[PDB]
Write a protein that binds this ligand. Structure first.
Ligand SMILES: Nc1ncnc2c1ncn2[C@@H]1O[C@H](COP(=O)(O)OP(=O)(O)OC[C@H]2O[C@@H](O)[C@H](O)[C@@H]2O)[C@@H](O)[C@H]1O
Length: 159
């Protein structure tokens, strides 16, 4: 069975075997998780472009980087975004299980730039749990907000 922890820290400082980038479909560097990932593992972005609702893995700079593209909720209906966000997390879970990845640092996809101006912490976290429950990985969820850290910890505990 998988294990879940939350850290309020820069995800670039994670101690896990792999890291999930909250990526865009074009594989460009922009504000958010992506900027921290690009600074720490700059060569991890070579050929990383992948469609919304999918994930693409690379080994670069001594790290396993999983580029997961959540939906931009400004560009899809709520129901379409919900399906695509579930799909991105399942694509992450598949990469974890098929590559025997023991531990992974994961941000909450579609909760920043792609949030469409809405609070989607619980929506994104619930899809993270559902998808990564299919793995036996040690999952560490990364955030920067003290409020988010507490709600994520509350959610982990309820399980
Ligand atoms: N370095 C970081 N470490 C940990 N958490 C972080 C970090 N940077 C941002 N976060 C948090 O991770 C969550 C996801 O943030 P985004 O990176 O904005 O993710 P998303 O909404 O999926 O959009 C990602 C996209 O932003 C675009 O600029 C860019 O193209 C990138 O692909 C947000 O709650 C944010 O507070």
């Amino acid at each position: 069975a998988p294990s879940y922890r939350v850290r309020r820290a820069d995800i670039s400082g994670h101690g896990e075997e792999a890291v999930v980038n909250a990526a865009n479909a074009k594989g460009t560097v922009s504000d958010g998780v992506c900027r921290a990932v690009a600074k720490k593992w700059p060569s991890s972005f070579k050929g990383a472009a992948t469609p919304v609702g999918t994930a693409k893995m690379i080994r670069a700079d001594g790290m396993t980087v999983i580029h997961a593209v959540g939906p931009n909720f400004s560009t899809v209906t709520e129901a379409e975004g919900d399906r695509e966000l579930a799909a991105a997390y399942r694509a992450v879970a598949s990469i974890i299980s098929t590559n025997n990845i023991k531990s992974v640092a994961v941000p909450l996809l579609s909760t920043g730039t792609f949030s469409g101006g809405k609070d989607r912490v619980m929506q994104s976290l619930n899809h993270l749990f559902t998808a990564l429950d299919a793995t036996d990985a040690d999952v560490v969820i990364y955030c920067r907000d003290k409020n988010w850290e507490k709600k994520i910890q509350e959610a982990i505990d309820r399980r």
